[PDB]
Ligand binder design. Structure first.
Ligand SMILES: CCCCCCCC/C=C\CCCCCCCC(=O)OC[C@H](COP(=O)(O)OCC[N+](C)(C)C)OC(=O)CCCCCCC/C=C\CCCCCCCC
Ligand SMILES: CCCCCCCC/C=C\CCCCCCCC(=O)OC[C@H](COP(=O)(O)OCC[N+](C)(C)C)OC(=O)CCCCCCC/C=C\CCCCCCCC
Ligand SMILES: CCCCCCCC/C=C\CCCCCCCC(=O)OC[C@H](COP(=O)(O)OCC[N+](C)(C)C)OC(=O)CCCCCCC/C=C\CCCCCCCC
Ligand SMILES: CCCCCCCCCCCCCCCCCC(=O)OC[C@H](COP(=O)(O)OC[C@H](N)C(=O)O)OC(=O)CCCCCCCCCCCCCCCCC
Ligand SMILES: CCCCCCCCCCCCCCCCCC(=O)OC[C@H](COP(=O)(O)OC[C@H](N)C(=O)O)OC(=O)CCCCCCCCCCCCCCCCC
Ligand SMILES: CCCCCCCCCCCCCCCCCCOC[C@@H](O)COP(=O)(O)OCC[N+](C)(C)C
Ligand SMILES: CCCCCCCCCCCCCCCCCCOC[C@@H](O)COP(=O)(O)OCC[N+](C)(C)C
Ligand SMILES: CCCCCCCCCCCCCCCCCCOC[C@@H](O)COP(=O)(O)OCC[N+](C)(C)C
Ligand SMILES: CCCCCCCCCCCCCCCCCCOC[C@@H](O)COP(=O)(O)OCC[N+](C)(C)C
Ligand SMILES: CCCCCCCCCCCCCCCCCCOC[C@@H](O)COP(=O)(O)OCC[N+](C)(C)C
Ligand SMILES: *[C@@H]1O[C@H](CO)[C@@H](O[C@@H]2O[C@H](CO)[C@@H](O)[C@H](O)[C@H]2NC(C)=O)[C@H](O)[C@H]1NC(C)=O
Ligand SMILES: CC(C)CCC[C@@H](C)[C@H]1CC[C@H]2[C@@H]3CC=C4C[C@@H](O)CC[C@]4(C)[C@H]3CC[C@]12C
Ligand SMILES: CC(C)CCC[C@@H](C)[C@H]1CC[C@H]2[C@@H]3CC=C4C[C@@H](O)CC[C@]4(C)[C@H]3CC[C@]12C
Ligand SMILES: CC(C)CCC[C@@H](C)[C@H]1CC[C@H]2[C@@H]3CC=C4C[C@@H](O)CC[C@]4(C)[C@H]3CC[C@]12C
Ligand SMILES: CC(C)CCC[C@@H](C)[C@H]1CC[C@H]2[C@@H]3CC=C4C[C@@H](O)CC[C@]4(C)[C@H]3CC[C@]12C
Ligand SMILES: *[C@@H]1O[C@H](CO)[C@@H](O)[C@H](O)[C@H]1NC(C)=O
Ligand SMILES: *[C@@H]1O[C@H](CO)[C@@H](O)[C@H](O)[C@H]1NC(C)=O
Ligand SMILES: *[C@@H]1O[C@H](CO)[C@@H](O)[C@H](O)[C@H]1NC(C)=O
Ligand SMILES: *[C@@H]1O[C@H](CO)[C@@H](O)[C@H](O)[C@H]1NC(C)=O
Length: 998
């Protein structure tokens, strides 16, 4: 333990400069957030003829609002008034720099950021989504890729530093190449009947599955008695894997024997472990077993440390935290319950909280433990748990990944067309038509029916567009030929899209438009943007990179599908059909009915006299192996996993109302899943990704990917920038006075005085606060005037001494820009202030933001900040290319959503600001979930299929006949997207991580 703990201390040492840089960026973004939004999360709709609010529909939070136009609107009779309290428990806000650093830490680790993004966009305005795009790319994505890329070197640095029976045996040993095949076929086929049980079986299907189970039991037991009466029972217990198969057969025998219907459904699912036998002929699953075994083997010390840390922090939490969680629980419990769901009143629950912090969900509890106990203890406990857990897990994952993996006239017309198709203006003209045709889809949104003219313009536009693209096709055919055209392999995209469009337009010619299949070809018209992939060279090179790696993804996806099949079958054994419940539903809000009225489905059928009561099911349940795959993806991505676990542990037998934590220990099912599925399948996936990328790069003679040919030239320039050590010593001035300023500014003392004065300006910035006072505002403005004068004095003194040498350097140009911006901003405020036309206050907050450049002046002497920022700049080209491809994907998916899901009812994730009725709103939701954040929130109103959730007989909204989504289409829009973004982003990581190494 000591040898490895010393290495962990070294890994903490290596975080030296990254901690500095993270603190600096977190602070700058804290000041930006504090400036722009201070006191905005306080705007809440309050009625008017104390305070009278109205809750947000389907929740109990007070409604957040705005007086702006794209900010968020109150219902009738509700004026957006700024009030005293903050949203959550008064802890999430931007009102002062300390809360601002809290919120920007929440954004760096991406814990429940989707909710803060919702709130600040709802309060200040959609346009401020530019802040989160910019603090999630720099905070979350980038500042994690510094941690992952410095731990790795610390761990590489560590490692690199160091008679009649014998006649029965005569056909006992007849195990030829055809018997083994029988065993494999039996394994697979038995798994296929285990993967075929569901909830509502009629008895006959259950009986068939039973007979099949018994047959496969006796088959494998027969195999075992054969083997024991084939070798000698001495050496039979010497092989590694025969012991495993024999323990499985004993457990199967016992489960058959002891007879209860569903008896300990873990014992009925224990057979599934047999698939691991199919690893002799499946080398990738052999490597998965190699990884797990090493995790508990040659790397046992690291997992021992991790277990020690989790046990210690669960204990400390229980002892310090626990008593007050008991009696203060009315202060953190849900509206109609009696205990909080997540608390620290016993070792299991304390461990569950420490685990959920290890997953990454570390704030939402902190608010509660601060509302129940002391605040300093909560902050220290949770934040030390977080840093230490997400450091030991990170180091263990790196170690498993690193060592364990890395062990005549016709000829003339053809020729005419042919010279023309290559001519540069021709290509650019076609690209232009693609850009307009793609962009014209964004105008086809919900409201287009009430715009009687824009529609017709778009229709004529589409007709001219099908013409123009068909003409390009025929030009390219009689240019190239039928034989070369198709072989190129980018032309098939164009031909398919053109055929789809020429089915659609013809269907608008005839009366067969509303025949459902052609109306399902039409919806495909959202792939028109995809014609852009070929024309842009950067998207082309990135697509080549991804298509080069689709094979390896396919192997690992097969292994992941088998392995999650195991857990989905366990889930169907354990939970299937028990997620149902009753709910008294009145208006938009649903509460489980107390167990003193129901306990049964045959009690909702009786107490339904009012009609509020309805018998329902959770949207993402475990009733099938199919729905089990979705519930496993939601657990493995940690989104919507909580509504799952609550009804897993509430569960009882079938047709019975669920009880408050009547299955407390089913959380072990989800813990075990996350550990094995998430941690180890992900480790396997990333291992094959790195190996693939390494060999892929090495093939090309060790050049770069995601980068074009000209990007390599820009790279040569940037690389030659950050190396040039000598610069001409500047000449000394002649004039006596122009010599003296030269003498004074050029020493080190002036630089250090200005450095510390920037720091004192920062301190003057951090005191700024919502609703402070009048006097403090005035005094801070006077002090601000003192700095803008001194920094002007600094620049003018530089100019007088260094006339042109100044304008040679770059940092001199930067602080020149910020000096002129600060003076201009003060002049702009002076004029546009109450002296002149009083526009919106919010303009003043944006104006006051020219000061933060003063802060960013600070990185001239800072080695660490400057070097890691130069690494970011070197990466930015490839980041641009993959950003282009991710943009195209977000764009296509935007139109798909905007055409398929606008009429869905407003519910959990879809409200009057984040929905799919417009290109702004749809792009908002798609960006929220590019990071997979909150995607279960949007998907939930899709799966609606009737009362109480949707009204399928609505007179208006001629869509799915009412406010209902398409469950088949949600699960494939939302699931594939987060997989495509996942694989797109993964290639964004490989860019920067391979930039830090250099
Ligand atoms: C939930 C289920 C998740 C995982 C269960 C994995 C079961 C793997 C069985 C391995 C059987 C074995 O024995 O493989 C022998 C081979 C060959 O043996 P040989 O040719 O050298 O002779 O060994 C090798 O090749 C490589 C040696 C790798 C040893 C793998 C050890 C896997 C143990 C997993 C248990 C982890 C805790 C589970 C807690 C559940 C609650
Ligand atoms: C999406 C947005 C994406 C990115 C935005 C920021 C990306 C650009 C960051 C530029 C920082 C920079 O270019 O500096 C670094 C260079 C380094 O030079 P070196 O001699 O140390 O070599 C380094 C020695 N080696 C070779 C070992 C590395 O310095 C120089 O080139 C000096 C010349 C440049 C002077 C003006 C550049 C700085 C202006 C603004 C930077 C502010 C960045 C803010 C980032 C967010 C903070 C919250
Ligand atoms: C800010 C966001 C991104 C930063 C943009 C620039 C980042 C790129 C860094 C490198 C660069 O491309 O730099 C421009 C180059 C620096 O190369 P060099 O001359 O040292 O090469 C030496 C060769 N020799 C001696 C012949 C000159 O030429 C220069 O000097 C000009 C560099 C001056 C920097 C222009 C960027 C100023 C824009 C905004 C400033 C921030 C104000 C608002 C604060 C944000 C509010 C929240
Ligand atoms: C290797 C191990 C590494 C461990 C690193 C993590 C260690 C974390 C230590 C944090 C220590 C915090 C000390 C101050 C906490 C006690 C003061 C306190 O009252 O806190 C709570 C405050 C808000 O209080 P309130 O609601 O206004 O009620 C105040 C009233 N007087 C009362 O006591 O009722 O709430 C606040 O003051 C907000 C504070 C936000 C701080 C954000 C810190 C980010 C973490 C660092 C990130 C970079 C890494
Ligand atoms: C490693 C990560 C792997 C991740 C795998 C994720 C796969 C999710 C598959 C979900 C399949 C699924 O949920 O089927 C179920 C849906 C539900 O429809 P319904 O009308 O409400 O009927 C409900 C009733 N309980 C019933 O199914 O009877 O039945 C449907 O109607 C949906 C049918 C089509 C679902 C196809 C999913 C393809 C996803 C592609 C994922 C890979 C992308 C690359
Ligand atoms: C670097 C920091 C980046 C932060 C970007 C954060 C986003 O910036 C917010 C503003 O740009 C939004 O628009 P304005 O505030 O300029 O509009 C004012 C004019 N009206 C709307 C009042 C009429
Ligand atoms: C290298 C080795 C690995 C390669 C894999 C190759 C192995 C091949 C495996 C083949 C798998 C084939 C599995 C066979 C399963 C067929 C699937 C069997 O179907 C049975 C049901 O369709 C019948 O349903 P019931 O008879 O219960 O009636 C339903 C109840 N009602 C509706 C009537 C009331
Ligand atoms: C890169 C290639 C893919 C994208 C191809 C270019 O897409 C550009 C569009 O985002 C331009 O904006 P919109 O036309 O969506 O904005 C208008 C929205 N309203 C106001 C009409 C609703
Ligand atoms: C009901 C159906 C609904 C379908 C909805 C989903 C639609 C998704 C469509 C995705 C299309 C993806 C297209 C990807 C095309 C990649 C195609 C990548 O191939 C590139 C080569 O063709 C380039 O040609 P060169 O001549 O430069 O060199 C040849 C290089 N090789 C080929 C010899 C190695
Ligand atoms: C998602 C991440 C988004 C990062 C977005 C990063 O944007 C930075 C780009 O502007 C830098 O691009 P370059 O200067 O390399 O431009 C060269 C490419 N062309 C324009 C010459 C073709
Ligand atoms: C309780 O009664 C209400 C109304 O009497 C039932 O609501 C009906 O639900 C069915 C399908 O479940 C719909 O076809 C009807 O249109 C609904 N009727 C009304 C008036 O809303 C509800 O199903 C009953 N709940 C249970 C399970 O007993
Ligand atoms: C209860 C189930 C689901 C958990 C997973 C089953 C695993 C852990 C069990 C089943 C069979 C067991 C293995 C069978 C025999 C051996 C060979 C011995 O030299 C080392 C231990 C080892 C390798 C056992 C370790 C534990 C084991 C692998
Ligand atoms: C439904 C589940 C339980 C059964 C899985 C069926 C498929 C995916 C499994 C069963 C047998 C497996 C194959 C067994 C043997 C080989 C040979 C190896 O060189 C490549 C992998 C390959 C080709 C495996 C791929 C995955 C595989 C085909
Ligand atoms: C199932 C439906 C919807 C899609 C089928 C479209 C197929 C037939 C189209 C789309 C892309 C086309 C392929 C693109 C790449 C090449 C180049 C070379 O390898 C031979 C032809 C081949 C392989 C094309 C054959 C036809 C092709 C495969
Ligand atoms: C060098 C000394 C003076 C301060 C060093 C840390 C400074 C820069 C920062 C860190 C945290 C900041 C504090 C965060 C929030 C508040 C609460 C507000 O009601 C008064 C200002 C005050 C108290 C800030 C003062 C400046 C501050 C203390
Ligand atoms: C919103 O505008 C109303 C007047 O219409 C005003 O009374 C209210 O205070 C405003 N709130 C804010 C924060 O702008
Ligand atoms: C919870 O908060 C209320 C005040 O809102 C308090 O009266 C009650 O006693 C608290 N919890 C306990 C200890 O039951
Ligand atoms: C259901 O909710 C309504 C209030 O909206 C209430 O009046 C009714 O008594 C409740 N019934 C039960 C027992 O759930
Ligand atoms: C339903 O619950 C009641 C107790 O409230 C019980 O007496 C009755 O037999 C139960 N019936 C069913 C449907 O099991």
């Amino acid at each position: 333990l000591k040898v490895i703990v010393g290495a962990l201390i070294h890994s903490v040492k290596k975080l030296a400069d990254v901690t500095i840089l993270t603190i600096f960026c977190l602070s700058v973004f804290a000041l930006v957030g504090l400036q722009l939004f201070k006191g905005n999360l306080k705007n809440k709709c309050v009625k008017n003829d104390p305070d009278i609010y109205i809750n947000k529909r389907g929740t109990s939070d007070p409604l957040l609002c705005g007086n702006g136009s794209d900010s968020g609107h109150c219902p009738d009779g509700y004026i957006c008034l700024k009030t005293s309290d903050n949203p959550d428990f008064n802890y999430t806000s931007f009102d002062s720099f300390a809360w601002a650093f809290l919120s920007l830490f929440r954004l760096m680790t991406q814990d429940s950021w989707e909710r803060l993004y919702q709130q600040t966009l709802r309060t200040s305005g959609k346009i401020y989504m530019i802040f989160f795009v910019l603090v999630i790319f720099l905070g979350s994505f980038y500042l994690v890729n510094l941690i992952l890329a410095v731990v790795t070197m610390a761990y590489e640095e560590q490692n690199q530093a160091t008679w009649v029976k014998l006649k029965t045996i005569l056909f006992g040993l007849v195990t030829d190449p055809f018997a083994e095949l029988t065993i494999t076929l039996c394994i697979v086929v038995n798994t296929i009947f285990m993967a075929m049980e569901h909830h509502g079986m009629s008895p006959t299907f259950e009986a068939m599955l039973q007979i099949g189970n018994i047959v496969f039991t006796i088959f494998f037991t027969a195999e075992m008695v054969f083997k024991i009466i084939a070798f000698d029972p001495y050496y039979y217990f010497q092989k590694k894997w025969n012991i495993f198969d024999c323990i499985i057969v004993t457990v199967s025998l016992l489960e058959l024997g002891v007879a209860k219907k569903g008896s300990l459904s873990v014992l009925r699912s224990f057979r599934l472990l047999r698939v691991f036998k199919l690893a002799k002929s499946w080398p990738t699953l052999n490597t998965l077993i190699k990884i797990i075994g090493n995790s508990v083997g040659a790397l046992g010390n690291l997992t021992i440390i991790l277990a020690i840390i989790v046990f210690v922090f669960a204990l400390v939490g229980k002892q310090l935290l626990g008593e007050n969680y008991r009696n203060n629980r009315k202060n953190i419990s849900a509206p109609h319950e009696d205990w909080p769901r997540w608390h620290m009143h016993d070792f299991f629950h304390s461990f569950l909280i420490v685990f959920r912090i290890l997953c990454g969900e570390w704030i939402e509890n902190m608010w509660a433990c601060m509302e129940v106990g002391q605040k300093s203890i909560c902050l220290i406990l949770f934040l030390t748990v977080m840093v230490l857990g997400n450091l030991v897990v990170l180091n263990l994952f790196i170690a498993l990944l690193l060592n364990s993996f890395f062990a005549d006239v016709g000829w003339q017309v053809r020729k005419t067309c042919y010279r023309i198709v290559e001519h540069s203006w021709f290509e650019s003209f076609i690209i232009f038509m693609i850009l307009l045709s793609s962009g014209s889809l964004a105008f086809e949104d919900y409201y287009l029916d009430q715009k009687p003219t824009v529609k017709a313009l778009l229709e004529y536009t589409d007709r001219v567009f099908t013409f123009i693209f068909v003409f390009e096709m025929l030009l390219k055919w009689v240019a190239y030929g039928f034989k070369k055209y198709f072989t190129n392999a980018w032309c098939w995209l164009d031909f398919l899209i053109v055929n789809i469009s020429l089915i659609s337009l013809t269907a608008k010619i005839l009366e067969y438009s509303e025949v459902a299949p052609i109306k399902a070809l039409r919806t495909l018209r959202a792939l028109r943007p995809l014609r852009a992939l070929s024309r842009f060279e950067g998207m082309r090179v990135v697509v080549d990179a991804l298509v080069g790696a689709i094979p390896s993804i396919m192997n690992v996806l097969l292994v992941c599908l088998i392995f999650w099949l195991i857990f989905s079958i366990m889930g169907v054994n354990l939970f299937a059909g028990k997620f149902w419940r009753c709910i008294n539903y009145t208006d938009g809000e649903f509460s489980l009915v107390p167990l003193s009225i129901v306990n049964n489905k045959s009690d909702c059928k009786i107490q339904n006299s009012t009609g509020s009561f309805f018998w329902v099911n959770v949207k993402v349940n475990f009733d099938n192996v199919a729905m089990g795959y979705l519930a496993l993806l939601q657990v493995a991505t940690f989104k919507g996993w909580m509504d799952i676990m609550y009804a897993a542990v509430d569960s009882r037998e079938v047709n019975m109302q669920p009880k408050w934590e009547d299955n407390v220990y089913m959380y072990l099912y989800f813990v075990i899943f996350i550990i094995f599925g998430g941690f180890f399948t992900l480790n396997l996936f990333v291992g094959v990704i790195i190996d693939n990328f390494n060999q892929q790069k090495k093939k090309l003679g060790g050049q770069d990917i995601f980068m074009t040919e000209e990007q390599k030239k820009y790279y040569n320039a940037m690389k030659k920038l950050g190396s040039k050590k000598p610069q001409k010593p500047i000449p000394r001035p002649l004039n006596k006075f122009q010599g003296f300023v030269f003498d004074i500014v050029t020493r080190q003392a002036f630089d250090i005085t200005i450095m510390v004065l920037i720091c004192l300006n920062m301190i003057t910035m951090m005191v700024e606060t919502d609703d402070q006072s009048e006097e403090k505002t005035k005094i801070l403005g006077k002090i601000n005037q003192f700095f803008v004068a001194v920094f002007t004095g600094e620049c003018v003194m530089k100019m007088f001494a260094l006339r042109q040498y100044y304008f040679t350097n770059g940092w001199n140009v930067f602080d020149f820009i910020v000096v002129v911006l600060s003076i201009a901003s003060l002049i702009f405020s002076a004029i546009l202030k109450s002296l002149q036309s009083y526009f919106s206050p919010t303009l003043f907050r944006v104006i006051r933001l020219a000061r933060i450049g003063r802060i960013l002046r600070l990185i001239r002497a800072a080695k660490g900040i400057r070097t890691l920022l130069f690494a970011l700049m070197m990466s930015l080209p490839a980041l641009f290319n993959i950003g282009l491809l991710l943009f195209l994907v977000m764009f296509i998916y935007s139109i798909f959503g905007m055409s398929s899901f606008p009429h869905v009812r407003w519910e959990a994730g879809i409200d009057d600001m984040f929905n799919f009725q417009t290109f702004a709103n749809s792009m908002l939701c798609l960006f929220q979930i590019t990071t997979s954040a909150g995607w279960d929130g949007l998907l939930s109103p899709i799966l609606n299929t009737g009362p109480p959730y949707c009204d399928p007989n609505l007179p208006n909204s001629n869509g799915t006949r009412g406010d209902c989504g398409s469950p088949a289409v949600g699960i494939i829009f939302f699931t594939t997207y987060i997989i495509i973004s996942f694989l797109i982003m993964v290639n964004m990581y490989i860019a920067v991580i391979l930039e830090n190494f250099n």
